[PDB]
């Protein structure tokens, strides 16, 4: 078998973290249009038979806590795991509403030795966020 | 008897390392728009990496920023697929 | 179009 076993009773969780409004003291602008993203994802992964949970405007502490809790759920009947992050970012960093979170800290909860119910199962992180401030000028074809 | 603790992760990034990522205030982000569209179209026909490859092509060819600010006008984006997966991933049962 |  060259393909992951996807016929567990459940496809798995799809966590969508949708950060639109940030605390004023961060200086971060509101991410207009991200609700269109969150709704589109919700419906798309519903049709793929994922159990979608949309969360909105989470602090960096709420994000970390959410990932810890989700990593501690019973995933034994689930084929895979999906987490979508919609926020401001920089390289290796996603922003809570009140400050930054290391992407590594988020994904470490799901490491093969720390989330045993997901050992051997695909863990997908979909990240809509800046990775810096470079602009791609493109080249004509 | 063991697998790496880093195995079986995939990180679908909206943009290349070091780069801005583009979001349209009305249509949503270029990447999520394209990702949902390609999943809709191909989740029943294609392996996941080949779907994400279509997302790469859609973002790269069909999107270009329009801005009154010359610094930010006419810019492009390529998403970034980072795969530590050990097997093929199909969404159809 | 805006930047994130
Ligand atoms: Na994008």
Closest C-chain CA to B22: C3
A131: CATH: 3.40.50.1460
- Neighboring chain A residues of C3 at a CB cutoff of 8 Å: 130
Give catalytic residue positions of A: 88, 130
| Domain coordinates in residue numbering, chain B | 1-93
Asked if the Cβ–Cβ distance from A131 to B17 is below 8 Å, we say yes
Asked if the Cβ–Cβ distance from C4 to A89 is below 8 Å, we say yes
Chains sharing 3 or more CB pairs under 8 A with chain A: B, C
Burial A93-129 (b: 16+ CB within 10 A, else e): bbbbbeebbebeebbebbbbeebebbbebbbbbbbbb
Give the domain extent around A17. 1-141
Nearest to B24 by CA among B66, B62, B56, B80: B66
Count of domains in chain A?
Answer: 1
Q: Report resolution in angstroms.
A: 2.1
In degrees rounded to 5, what are phi and psi of residue A102?
Answer: -60, 125
The answer to whether A96 and A19 are in contact (CB under 8 A) is yes
Question: What is the fold, at CATH topology level, of the domain defined by B1-93?
Answer: Alpha-Beta Plaits (3.30.70)
- Neighboring chain A residues of C1 at a CB cutoff of 8 Å: none
Nearest to A83 by CA among A36, A18, A3, A31: A18
Alpha-carbon distance of A137 to A63, in angstroms, equals 34
Q: Cα of A51 to ligand 1 centre, how many Å?
A: 24
Alpha-carbon distance of A75 to A91, in angstroms, equals 30
Q: How was this structure determined?
A: X-ray
Query: Chain C contact for A94, CB < 8 A?
Result: no
Specify whether the backbone of A98 is left (phi greater than 0), alpha (psi in -120 to 50) or beta: alpha
Three-class DSSP category at B37: helix
The partner residue sitting opposite A48, judged by closest CB among B5, B43, B74, is B43
Strands, sheet with A81-86, edge to edge from the N-terminal-most edge strand: A51-56, A13-18, A81-86, A123-128, B9-13, B80-83
DSSP sequence for A59-119: -HHHHHHHHHHHHHS--TTBS-EEEEEES-EETTEEEETTEEEEHHHHHHTT-TTT-GGGT
Strands, sheet with B22-24, edge to edge from the N-terminal-most edge strand: B28-29, B22-24, C2-3
């Amino acid at each position: 078998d060259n393909s992951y076993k996807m016929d567990y009773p459940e496809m798995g969780l799809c966590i969508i973290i949708n950060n639109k409004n940030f605390h004023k003291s961060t200086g971060m602008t509101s991410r207009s249009g991200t609700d269109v993203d969150a709704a589109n994802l919700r419906e798309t992964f519903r049709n793929l038979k994922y159990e979608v949970r949309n969360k909105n405007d989470l602090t960096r502490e709420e994000i970390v806590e959410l990932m810890r809790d989700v990593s501690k759920e019973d995933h034994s009947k689930r084929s895979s795991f999906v987490c979508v992050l919609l926020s401001h970012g920089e390289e290796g960093i996603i922003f809570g509403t009140n400050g930054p979170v290391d992407l590594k800290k988020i994904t470490n909860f799901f490491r093969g030795d720390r989330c045993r119910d997901l050992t051997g199962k695909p863990k997908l992180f979909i990240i809509q966020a800046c990775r810096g401030t470079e602009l791609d000028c493109g080249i004509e074809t | 008897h063991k697998i790496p603790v880093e195995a079986d992760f995939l990180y679908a990034y909206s943009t290349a390392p070091g780069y801005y990522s583009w979001r349209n205030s009305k249509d949503g982000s270029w990447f999520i728009q394209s990702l949902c569209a390609m999943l809709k179209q191909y989740a029943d026909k294609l392996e996941f990496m080949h779907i994400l490859t279509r997302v790469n092509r859609k973002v790269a060819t069909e999107f270009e920023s329009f801005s009154f600010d010359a610094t930010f006008h006419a810019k492009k984006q390529i998403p970034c697929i980072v795969s530590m997966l050990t097997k093929e991933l199909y969404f159809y049962h | 179009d805006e930047v994130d």
